[PDB]
Write a protein that binds this ligand. Structure first.
Ligand SMILES: *[C@@H]1O[C@H](CO)[C@@H](O[C@@H]2O[C@H](CO)[C@@H](O[C@@H]3O[C@H](CO)[C@@H](O)[C@H](O)[C@@H]3O)[C@H](O)[C@H]2NC(C)=O)[C@H](O)[C@H]1NC(C)=O
Ligand SMILES: *[C@@H]1O[C@H](CO)[C@@H](O[C@@H]2O[C@H](CO)[C@@H](O[C@@H]3O[C@H](CO)[C@@H](O)[C@H](O)[C@@H]3O)[C@H](O)[C@H]2NC(C)=O)[C@H](O)[C@H]1NC(C)=O
Ligand SMILES: *[C@@H]1O[C@H](CO)[C@@H](O[C@H]2O[C@H](CO)[C@@H](O[C@H]3O[C@H](CO)[C@@H](O)[C@H](O)[C@@H]3O)[C@H](O)[C@H]2NC(C)=O)[C@H](O)[C@H]1NC(C)=O
Ligand SMILES: *[C@@H]1O[C@H](CO[C@@H]2O[C@@H](C)[C@@H](O)[C@@H](O)[C@@H]2O)[C@@H](O[C@@H]2O[C@H](CO)[C@@H](O)[C@H](O)[C@H]2NC(C)=O)[C@H](O)[C@H]1NC(C)=O
Ligand SMILES: *[C@@H]1O[C@H](CO[C@@H]2O[C@@H](C)[C@@H](O)[C@@H](O)[C@@H]2O)[C@@H](O[C@@H]2O[C@H](CO)[C@@H](O)[C@H](O)[C@H]2NC(C)=O)[C@H](O)[C@H]1NC(C)=O
Ligand SMILES: *[C@H]1O[C@H](CO[C@@H]2O[C@@H](C)[C@@H](O)[C@@H](O)[C@@H]2O)[C@@H](O[C@@H]2O[C@H](CO)[C@@H](O)[C@H](O)[C@H]2NC(C)=O)[C@H](O)[C@H]1NC(C)=O
Ligand SMILES: *[C@@H]1O[C@H](CO)[C@@H](O[C@@H]2O[C@H](CO)[C@@H](O)[C@H](O)[C@H]2NC(C)=O)[C@H](O)[C@H]1NC(C)=O
Ligand SMILES: *[C@@H]1O[C@H](CO)[C@@H](O[C@@H]2O[C@H](CO)[C@@H](O)[C@H](O)[C@H]2NC(C)=O)[C@H](O)[C@H]1NC(C)=O
Ligand SMILES: *[C@@H]1O[C@H](CO)[C@@H](O[C@@H]2O[C@H](CO)[C@@H](O)[C@H](O)[C@H]2NC(C)=O)[C@H](O)[C@H]1NC(C)=O
Ligand SMILES: *[C@H]1O[C@H](CO)[C@@H](O[C@@H]2O[C@H](CO)[C@@H](O)[C@H](O)[C@H]2NC(C)=O)[C@H](O)[C@H]1NC(C)=O
Ligand SMILES: *[C@H]1O[C@H](CO)[C@@H](O[C@H]2O[C@H](CO)[C@@H](O)[C@H](O)[C@H]2NC(C)=O)[C@H](O)[C@H]1NC(C)=O
Ligand code: NAG
Ligand code: NAG
Ligand code: NAG
Lengths: 726, 728
């Protein structure tokens, strides 16, 4: 009855989801990138015009992998010679096209190997980083003003983050923030002088005679961290005969007393900036609010105007303290924080008042604040139907907190229970993005009355393609572990029959604040497994899970490798007793933190799992980065948590691996979870005489995403899974 | 009843081959260590006495890894804190024990982390290397004299070899040579300033937070090679000048013209030293004979005493130029070189006459010269029965070369066909060591009449245990191709039945001058595969193999990855034709050069082999060291042999791997055949979407010899072979 969704369909991307990536250029229009050009759309009516046909550069001489139009609409930044570095970082060459004269700028161009570029928020000023220093161009074709002169590879970073700040703090390579109208350029400076370097071989193409050694400043748990400083420069004052003057904003004293991090920067007004700092022991943070002083020329951060955010049950924030949303005058702000009961809700602050007022409450949480107007605060939460894995857009009336309206819950309940949003500049319009449980649905709306203007993309095409294939279904439900309920999902094989017994694969991650049971529609490996191999692929969110309150999330505080691994086993245990689950054929697999939990479960002696696959797993927390690890584990010292750091390794369970079939996989050029972690696991298994399966991927990183490697690993894992299940 | 030889038997070393390791301290006595008490024996009567009691060093605070008694036997060097490095090199701590006063010396001790220590050949002088510099101690308790000040980590090596000289040039770590009576100390100096570094991670124990990066000066094919200098210093002047001058002996001009190597150094007399040099293009070699000029205090090498040795079809020597053996007076010497018929035989040289006189036969080869007396010259060869895989001890009468006697051939023809020997200091006695085809047998003889004095060890214990197990058998024979015979061996399952069809595993190496078919008795993995799994494990010595003449050994000159590979495929076809092999279950495996061949065969498209396993394989010759690679391949340049370098990689045959089951294994800390080699193979396979099996071994080197790692790899390979053959 029709074909199934095969491995090749997945690996070759036969059935592709359509998207609608737009970028608002004002409160009324937005740009829409296409294959052959770029169009500007009028949100009110839906009509459009061509901004440029790309063919404008058919003879540019280079392949452009990205365009960036000045908020001005007068210039286009052309990026090419792209070279990826870490998850967000990369280098590239840049050319600027002057749209006024429709001519490429030939003078004073951006240097090759530029690390980062960004237009100012309003006109056409540019700030970029080259060789670790900051540069500013007031006009696209004029000479640049050198802002910093201390940049030095692997030592001093100006305007860009180092490895650990890029990955675990800002999730970005950029370390510069323009003020609202472009007057000031704020930036951070990182000093990795005493930060140890992780080193690993990179083999490159066959033609390279000698392997090269990659070295990157990377702080593992307890090691020396990079230090940070913050500055602000006035881009309207830069001379040309004189060096630029950058003003530093330091302290707070409660932070300077020891190791700390800069964890958030958000401008409040044209002359007021907010900064959030976090102590190395991540259960205490402080927000400073600094104002410019023309007469003194400094940036003053009045005490009494700062706000302390701490936690007695765990760390601060889901992954870091939340971003504040300042009112128009910048005298007050809204921000998500953990309420008295441990659930995250919106709290309303006055910049000089100590206590804030929660404007939302209940046993559910706010995911994020998306827009703020004098009229309403728009946000996304999982309140609807009490489903932690679902998400809807709401608006709360700032004059009457009793008037909360769900703007997406009812649009199409059967198809849409998971949304994300994108508001125009002043929130006059918003694009809704439904991503499950049905096919993605993109729509446009107007805020004044929340009218549904039009459908932007409904994936009707794809829908017609899948009706011809035996697709699996998704069951989202829960089980109860003494008092508390925990959710799980199952990707079910076509024509599922509870009378029949199916082999089950536990797909796991389970890191702090993770969520693997949700209402999102996915076309992945699990789809193939259930559709072609008739394997049920389950996922479970137990202790440590997010979006359900701190009682659940902080349950594994200072105790990674305990409750989240046990709950994973407990869940698997209840699944086996279900009846439509063959208890003799149950497997488990995960990537990264998921590889860690997979490995820990397999070495627990549960006897529940037959086989398991660990990809790029963490094996012992002392090998992982400081920011992430310490957030949950504290410091690896005897005074603190060294004992648990030593009790939660994978290698300590080696002996228990004699009862299962294990497949260990890792990319040799993994800069995140070092290949070292899996090399130590295999050595421990060898020392105990445990046979297992292994696969290394040379020169692949944490994503093992090169086209051929991606195909190889899934092909290799599939053989392993069906071999185990047959 | 009666069990077979199980994997565990092999992995747990249940059946052990007893040995009899002795050390001659004179022409009449030898030392024999019994794990606890080191006693000394009298060759003549066999009576012994304790030389050093068991407890003598208890409370030492350290475990003695090894002992070393000085020539005059007055002192003993205690080696502890051993830390292995490469194949022969290792660092350690040392203490000297005064036997004259039963005192442990505590003054001016040898430094910790000392790289190498050696007694003078006479007396009790000492020469050691620390931080790449040479130091000399005239008296065990007195302060040392520094000889070199140029020592520099990974840059300048004094008295010790760099990586490639240790592994490929000398097959030894030490780079210093005391003169016979100990007056002079000769040494070489290696400058690796311009030599590229191979870098790889070493993870160490779990406790190490950040992995260490190992970097070793290692010249790959065609890269810059270390340069060498040779010096000779007079140690008897150390206590009179403050800074004794090291006299340099350079040239030859024919060598200085371009890249070269110092390949051998041996003293001829108290004042005569011979040096052998080899051009980077290893088809030309020169030996200088230099005499000390008591007048100018310099060392001069007369050109009339210079001996050239070149090759028109291949390289010089089996792996390098042959070592000379000088007559007592140093005016003439013997040396193994290939004759006009391509066979390696011993010829007699006079130091100032260029034409040498061959003293041995033809259709076979001399393996090595073992001892030289005024009367006879003793050597080992494979002449007996025309079996290239057998080894026997002979002796030829120096005054009449027609008089040659075999001393080992007839001792026990059924049990012994492979011998090695150890002569006493003046060749008055000698121990014979038989290693196959029966169980090892050690005997002691007196050279006067070659009379057998007694049996030192006959492995009677082992013999008994084995009569209680179904052991496999071994067949050694040959096959004829293009009218040339090629030898092979097969380890046959118990109760072999030529009427049945057995699965077969081709055990390969096949490197230049290699020999995998011989008479040696072995208790290894193959023993288990045959005995327990009933699999036939075979080996074939094809073109390129050694001990059979240059016609066969040089067949692969400048052509690695060809004939040698094709011949292993033919061997499997030839074995199949024998009628007792299952055409559907033929596999192949190898280690190192054997991994390269296994891989090249699996990617050949033959379809003779179902599955294969490659351990630490070479994948492309441009990744292997210069000395070994260039010897057979020349330079990887377009003007020379680059085309074949590029045409002989394993990666270029990845597509062909879709039709076979492949298992690739490699140690991550392999300093010899770099992990890089397998890393590029796996990547090539991933690039064409071919599935395969893999296993890396964290921190294991080329030997993957750690106890746990050893048991693990053989256990893993067994699962693969059994699964491939549908066993058990
Ligand atoms: C080992 O071999 C290297 C060659 O790679 C030798 O290094 C070379 O040493 C000479 C010393 O005469 C250097 O020349 C000097 O260069 C400086 C420039 O900084 C100049 O001021 C001096 O007047 C002189 O010309 C040469 O640069 C250097 N080459 C390299 C690549 O380092 C080294 O001496 C050898 N060591 C031994 C113990 O043989
Ligand atoms: C024992 O004698 C040897 C041989 O003379 C001494 O070695 C030599 O020592 C000098 C000075 O330490 C080395 O440096 C030289 O410096 C000059 C001037 O800067 C420069 O022009 C030369 O190129 C060289 O770098 C010299 O290279 C070195 N030569 C050798 C063969 O080692 C040694 O220092 C003496 N030991 C004692 C304790 O006096
Ligand atoms: C980046 O951060 C560095 C420290 O992590 C700053 O530096 C400071 O710390 C070093 C120690 O690493 C001090 O000492 C250095 O010099 C002495 C003497 O030469 C050495 O003995 C010592 O080992 C260090 O190499 C420096 O004195 C100190 N710097 C200053 C200016 O006092 C570094 O300045 C900083 N860079 C920037 C741009 O902020
Ligand atoms: C999209 O079209 C509008 C004009 O649309 C028409 O007029 C509207 C009032 C309404 O009746 C629609 O149904 C009609 O189709 C463009 O508006 C013009 O914008 C330019 C500058 O951008 C301005 O000079 C004109 O005065 C505007 N016209 C009107 C009537 O206001 C708009 O520019 C179009 N957007 C794009 C991206 O093409
Ligand atoms: C081994 O024993 C000999 C003793 O030899 C004896 O006489 C022989 C003719 C023969 O009958 C043997 O069986 C006898 O045991 C020791 O030889 C002595 O050596 C010392 C010098 O070291 C010498 O001064 C003595 O005269 C020798 N003894 C005789 C009788 O001549 C020899 O030392 C013993 N070696 C060991 C290692 O124990
Ligand atoms: C960035 O480099 C490009 C390419 O130049 C080459 O590659 C560089 C990495 C470096 O190795 C240069 O020496 C190479 O020439 C520059 O583009 C120009 O390209 C033309 C032809 O392709 C060449 O004749 C020019 O010399 C190159 N450079 C200049 C200044 O003309 C590009 O200009 C460089 N970026 C900047 C800001 O100059
Ligand atoms: C701006 O500041 C920079 C950094 O101090 C100055 O540049 C350095 O000037 C010194 C002295 O001339 C040179 O030795 C360095 O090579 C320069 N570069 C660096 C990175 O230090 C620069 O001179 C200053 N310019 C003005 C106008 O004051
Ligand atoms: C961008 O913001 C800056 C800072 O508020 C504005 O600059 C100020 O302009 C006022 C004029 O009303 C001056 O009195 C201040 O001295 C300026 N401050 C500084 C630091 O220069 C600027 O006007 C804003 N830009 C625009 C286009 O409105
Ligand atoms: C933030 O974390 C620190 C460190 O875990 C807490 O301080 C420690 O608390 C434990 C008891 O819970 C004591 O044994 C230690 O002596 C305390 N100090 C240190 C340096 O470890 C601190 O209480 C936490 N803050 C909050 C608000 O809970
Ligand atoms: C062994 O070493 C030398 C070998 O040259 C012997 O000969 C002496 O050598 C030195 C040169 O180093 C000359 O100055 C002496 O004249 C040589 N001796 C004679 C008698 O001419 C030396 O005799 C031997 N030393 C020992 C300890 O045996
Ligand atoms: C040893 O082999 C080398 C191979 O490099 C020979 O080198 C040269 O001479 C050959 C014969 O005349 C030429 O065919 C080669 O092209 C040339 N090699 C180079 C790099 O130019 C060398 O002659 C041989 N020596 C002997 C004695 O045969
Ligand atoms: C309660 O549930 C948790 C996890 O669901 C489990 O670890 C624990 O044993 C149960 N009982 C108690 C008293 O905590
Ligand atoms: C060698 O090292 C040990 C341990 O550090 C030390 O006790 C001993 O004195 C050292 N010996 C020498 C000769 O330096
Ligand atoms: C004949 O050539 C060699 C012997 O010279 C032999 O090994 C081979 O099998 C035969 N044929 C071919 C094509 O090599």
């Amino acid at each position: 009855s029709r074909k199934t969704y095969t491995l090749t369909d997945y690996l070759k991307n036969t059935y592709r989801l359509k998207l609608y990536s737009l970028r608002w250029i004002s409160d009324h229009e937005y740009l829409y990138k296409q294959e052959n050009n770029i169009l500007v759309f009028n949100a009110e009516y839906g009509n459009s015009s061509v901004f440029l046909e790309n063919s404008t550069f058919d003879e540019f001489g280079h392949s452009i992998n990205d365009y960036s139009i000045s908020p001005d609409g007068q210039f286009i930044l052309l990026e090419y010679n792209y070279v990826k570095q870490w998850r967000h970082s990369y280098t590239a060459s840049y050319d600027i096209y002057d749209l006024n004269k429709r001519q490429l700028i030939t003078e004073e161009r951006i240097p090759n190997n530029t690390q980062w570029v960004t237009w100012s928020p309003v006109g056409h000023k540019l700030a970029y980083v080259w060789n670790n220093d900051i540069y500013v161009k007031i006009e696209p074709n004029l000479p640049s003003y050198r802002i910093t002169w201390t940049g030095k590879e692997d030592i001093i970073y100006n305007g860009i983050t180092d490895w650990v700040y890029e990955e675990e703090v800002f999730s970005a390579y950029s370390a510069l923030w323009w003020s609202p109208n472009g007057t000031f350029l704020a930036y951070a400076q990182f000093n990795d002088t005493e930060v140890p370097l992780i080193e690993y071989s990179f083999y490159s193409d066959e033609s390279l005679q000698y392997p090269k050694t990659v070295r990157v400043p990377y702080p593992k748990a307890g090691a020396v961290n990079p230090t940070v400083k913050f500055f602000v420069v006035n881009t309207d004052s830069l001379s040309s005969v004189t060096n630029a003057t950058s003003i530093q904003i330091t302290a707070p004293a409660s932070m300077l007393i020891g190791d700390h991090y800069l964890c958030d920067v958000t401008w409040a007004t044209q002359e007021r900036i907010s900064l959030q700092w976090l102590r190395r022991i991540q259960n205490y943070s402080v927000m400073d609010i600094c104002d410019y002083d023309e007469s003194s020329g400094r940036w003053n951060c009045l005490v009494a105007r700062q706000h302390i955010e701490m936690s007695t049950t765990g760390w601060v924030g889901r992954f870091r303290p939340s971003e504040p949303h300042f009112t128009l005058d910048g005298n007050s702000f809204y921000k998500i924080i953990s309420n008295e009961e441990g659930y995250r809700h919106i709290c309303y602050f006055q910049i000089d008042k100590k206590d804030c007022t929660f404007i939302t409450k209940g046993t559910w949480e706010v995911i994020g604040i998306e827009a703020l107007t004098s009229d309403y605060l728009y946000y996304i939460s999982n309140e609807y139907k009490g489903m932690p894995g679902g998400r809807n857009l709401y608006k709360i009336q700032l004059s009457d907190y009793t008037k909360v309206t769900c703007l997406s819950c009812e649009l199409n309940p059967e198809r849409c229970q998971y949304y994300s949003v994108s508001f125009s500049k002043e929130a006059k319009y918003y694009q809704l993005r439904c991503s499950g449980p049905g096919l993605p649905l993109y729509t446009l709306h107007s805020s004044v009355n929340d009218k549904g203007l039009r459908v932007l993309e409904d994936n009707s095409a794809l829908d017609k393609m899948l009706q011809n294939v035996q697709m699996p279904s998704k069951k989202l439900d829960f089980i109860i572990l003494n008092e508390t309920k925990f959710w799980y999902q199952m990707i079910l094989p076509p024509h599922f029959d509870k009378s029949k017994k199916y082999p089950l694969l536990l797909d796991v991650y389970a890191g702090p604040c993770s969520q693997k049971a949700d209402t999102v529609f996915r076309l992945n490996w699990a789809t193939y497994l259930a559709s072609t191999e008739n394997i049920i692929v389950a996922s479970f969110d137990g202790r440590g899970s997010g979006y359900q309150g701190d009682k659940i999330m902080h349950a594994i505080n200072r105790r990674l490798g305990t409750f989240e691994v046990e709950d994973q086993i407990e869940a698997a245990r209840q699944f086996s007793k279900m009846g439509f689950v063959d208890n003799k054929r149950i497997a488990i697999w995960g990537w990264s933190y998921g590889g860690y939990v997979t490995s820990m479960v397999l070495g627990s002696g549960s006897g529940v799992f037959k086989c398991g696959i660990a990809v790029a797993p963490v094996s012992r927390w002392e090998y992982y980065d400081s920011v992430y690890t310490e957030r949950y584990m504290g410091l690896p010292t005897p005074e603190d948590n060294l004992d648990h750091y030593r009790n939660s390794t994978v290698m300590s369970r080696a002996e228990n691996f004699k009862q299962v079939e294990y497949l260990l996989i890792h990319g040799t050029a993994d800069d995140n979870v070092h290949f070292q972690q899996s090399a130590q696991i295999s050595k421990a298994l060898v020392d105990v005489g445990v046979d297992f399966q292994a696969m290394w991927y040379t020169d692949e990183d944490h994503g093992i995403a090169s086209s051929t490697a991606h195909q190889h690993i899934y092909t290799h894992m599939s053989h392993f899974i069906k071999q185990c299940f047959s």
